[PDB]
Structure 1
């Protein structure tokens, strides 16, 4: 574990992370996809061998010795708010199990279902709270990666609020 497990947020490409593993915002089919998923495909294409997995699950594939945890959040275009919320919380619980199993001291993680799977809604708080619910009991340093300054500010505030 990390000596003093923390949360941090950085505004930059998760493909350039400084952590011991990465969480992909994957699609269920292991396709290159869009946004975070396409950046992860460019950086770690070998990790997309048999990475297909259902919504609400995570499947880890090694790129060399670097673990890529493919976490499939729900596409809120297709799910009801209620069912989408359940699957989004489930995907993060599976990430916590994988991070634990791998024995890493740090993990780079995007906010699941906040981009092209958001169904056009702002899900920063929903997604981040499900991330905390899953990851709080883990002792890995968690580094959240986002794109926009206003998201960075809100995520930072939410982390600092808990202390």
Structure 2
């Protein structure tokens, strides 16, 4: 009742925090990251510039929170998922870190709802089935011990990911 799967544009979901699967530069790029920057407006990039000035690039697995600009959210958490290189380079744990670190920032900033994209399944090539299992498992275990966020939304652009997620959520 606290976890939901939604097929659509994450930039239009009204929630407290929208998670952005970005690259270490935080300067924005393609895919959902590009869609998020456009919707949020130039204020997003300006906030990311300030972050870079204070902490440099965002390492894989790391997360940082900023304002959301024109997005229908109170904040945007930028995190970097691993690039898939076969599975023998800690990619599984790094993906987990991206989800967990993102959740921690959401809780730490007292937010109630967060929407996640299918991290690393874009151009990073993380195997979809395995990526979804990690995301579902990671989020599930987190909310089981944390009151915040209250609601988590897995926003999938690809029907393939949406089906995988709904199957995993009921397979528990």
Answer whether TM exceeds 0.5 for this pair: yes
Identify which range, 135-144 or 122-131, moves more after superposition: 122-131
Deviation of the 1:145 alpha carbon: 0.4
Could you tell me which residue of structure 2 aligns to residue 159 of structure 1?
169
Q: Secondary structure at the match of 1:38?
A: helix
Aligned equivalents of 1:57, 1:138: Cα separation in 2: 20
Identify which range, 42-51 or 8-17, moves more after superposition: 42-51
Aligned equivalents of 2:159, 2:118: Cα separation in 1: 15
**Number of residue pairs matched by the alignment:** 156
Task: Render the CA deviation track for 1:38-88: whole Å, top value 9, x for unaligned.
Answer: 1111112422323541111000011358211001111115x7534211211
Going from structure 1 to structure 2, the CA distance change for 1:23 and 1:154 (only over 3 Å counts) comes to same
Asked if 1:61 is matched to 2:66, the reply is yes
Deviation of the 1:134 alpha carbon: 4.1
Task: Render the CA deviation track for 1:134-162: whole Å, top value 9, x for unaligned.
Answer: 45433320011001223212211211233
Aligned equivalents of 1:117, 1:149: Cα separation in 2: 18
Q: Secondary structure at the match of 1:81?
A: coil
RMSD: 2.2
Asked if 1:71 is matched to 2:68, the reply is no
Deviation of the 1:133 alpha carbon: 4.0
Q: TM-score scaled by structure 2? A: 0.79
Identify which range, 30-39 or 153-162, moves more after superposition: 153-162
Identify which range, 153-162 or 25-34, moves more after superposition: 153-162
Could you tell me which residue of structure 1 aligns to residue 36 of structure 2?
40
Aligned equivalents of 1:151, 1:145: Cα separation in 2: 9
> 8 Å contact 1:113–1:127 — kept in the other structure?
no
Aligned equivalents of 1:156, 1:149: Cα separation in 2: 11
Going from structure 1 to structure 2, the CA distance change for 1:81 and 1:115 (only over 3 Å counts) comes to farther
Could you tell me which residue of structure 1 aligns to residue 54 of structure 2?
none
Which runs of structure 2 are paired with 1:100-119 in the superposition (5 Å)? 100-118=107-125
